């Protein structure tokens, strides 16, 4: 599970997740898994998908995780009333907008990449697409 | 809480006008009686003023 | 860099003089030669100007780099500015210490009737 080694601030206001992604191009590998939907990608979700991919490729080729969960999410404990200050950080998320290439793979055949990515895609909470490096 | 230790003092005109300025001092840094030229408004002149209590 | 250091030492006064809107008497001084300009408040246009590179001062003096030269230039620039109707100036040392030739020039420009 990924999280910032340190942070300037422990808690962050919720905010909003409008817009399209910035890093929308396969920039390190040949194939990538791109987000079509919008959402929060938890660190747990990120690692589930990574394990899925890695197992499938069977120690062949390289994998680039291009999303880092750096937004702390807090939850109020159960049986606590509203108030008495912001809740405790429970998990970290990465804000995903449509277009964001989240993972990349190289040094494997495209069909193995498509399968690896389909398996990872199934661990993820929003829709994705297979993408290739372009000119 | 209050951490202030600088003692308040009244600087008094060396003329007998009885005009005084007030200020404060660190009694450790300034053990002796403070002396300083200051305008006395009664005699309308700059004269020496010397420390006194209150 | 000596020139930059000097210009640094000059800026505070020059900026002040500009703020005051005063006519400025700028003095430059080099190991040989010495210079004096009266400049308008705008700081662009020179009203009067004397130096030891000028022929008339160069001839009338022995060395140009002397304190005696600085007295000549002080006198010259003052007379020329008084002709232009420049009375009351602000003296810009231009980063040199008020001393020796610079002060000598200043004194001579005061003696000639520039007020500062």
């Amino acid at each position: 599970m990924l999280q910032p080694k340190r942070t300037k601030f422990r808690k962050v206001q919720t905010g909003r997740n409008r817009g399209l992604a910035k890093g929308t191009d396969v920039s390190f590998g040949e194939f990538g898994l791109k987000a079509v939907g919008r959402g929060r990608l938890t660190a747990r979700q990120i690692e589930a998908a990574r394990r899925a991919m890695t197992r499938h490729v069977k120690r062949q080729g390289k994998i680039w995780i291009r999303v880092f969960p750096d937004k702390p999410i807090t939850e109020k404990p159960l049986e606590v009333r509203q108030g008495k200050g912001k809740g405790n950080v429970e998990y970290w998320v990465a804000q995903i907008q449509p277009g964001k290439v989240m993972y990349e793979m190289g040094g494997v055949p495209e069909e193995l990449a498509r399968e690896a990515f389909r398996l990872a895609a199934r661990k993820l909470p929003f829709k994705t697409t297979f993408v290739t490096k372009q000119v | 809480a209050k951490k202030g230790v600088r003692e308040k003092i009244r600087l008094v005109s060396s003329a007998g006008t009885g005009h005084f300025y007030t200020t404060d001092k660190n009694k450790r840094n300034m053990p002796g009686k403070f002396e300083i030229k200051k305008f006395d408004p009664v005699v309308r002149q700059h004269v020496m003023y010397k420390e006194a209590k209150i | 860099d000596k020139k930059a250091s000097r210009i640094r030492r000059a800026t505070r006064a020059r900026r002040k003089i500009a703020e005051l809107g005063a006519t400025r008497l700028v003095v430059h001084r080099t190991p040989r030669h010495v210079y004096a300009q009266v400049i308008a408040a705008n700081g662009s246009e020179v009203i009067a100007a004397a130096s030891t590179v000028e022929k008339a001062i160069r001839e009338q003096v022995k060395y140009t780099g002397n304190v005696d030269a600085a007295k000549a230039v002080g006198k010259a620039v003052a007379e020329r500015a008084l002709e232009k109707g420049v009375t009351a100036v602000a003296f810009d040392r231009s980063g040199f210490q008020y001393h020796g030739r610079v002060a000598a020039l200043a004194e001579s420009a005061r003696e000639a009737g520039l007020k500062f």
């Binding site: 399209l20 992604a21 929308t24 791109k34 987000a35 079509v36 449509p98 277009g99 697409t129 372009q134 000119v135 | - | -």
Partner: protein
């Protein structure tokens, strides 16, 4: 490769978007001494040839009847759909 291109009369967001709804895409041709020209291209036409290498080496754009040799300079792609939103062609 030769593509028909129409010079854009209406420019900006509302127009650009309408083209893209109509299966076309705004594009611009610049380079040399001639002013940049804003053109409409057919999406399917261009995009179908963008798999070919020759496309990137050079194409001809028939703009206002006149053949213009241009190389692709920049492509703005859609965020996640396999579409092209805009292209810059540099006169060759």
């Amino acid at each position: 490769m030769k593509f028909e291109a129409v010079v854009r009369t209406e420019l900006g967001k509302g127009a650009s978007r309408r083209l893209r709804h109509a299966g076309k895409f705004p594009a611009v041709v610049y380079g040399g001494e001639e002013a940049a020209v804003a053109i409409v291209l057919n999406h399917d036409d261009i995009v179908n040839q963008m798999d070919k290498p020759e496309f990137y080496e050079g194409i001809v754009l028939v703009i206002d009847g006149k053949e213009v040799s241009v190389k692709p300079q920049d492509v703005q792609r859609h965020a996640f759909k396999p579409k092209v939103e805009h292209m810059d062609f540099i006169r060759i």
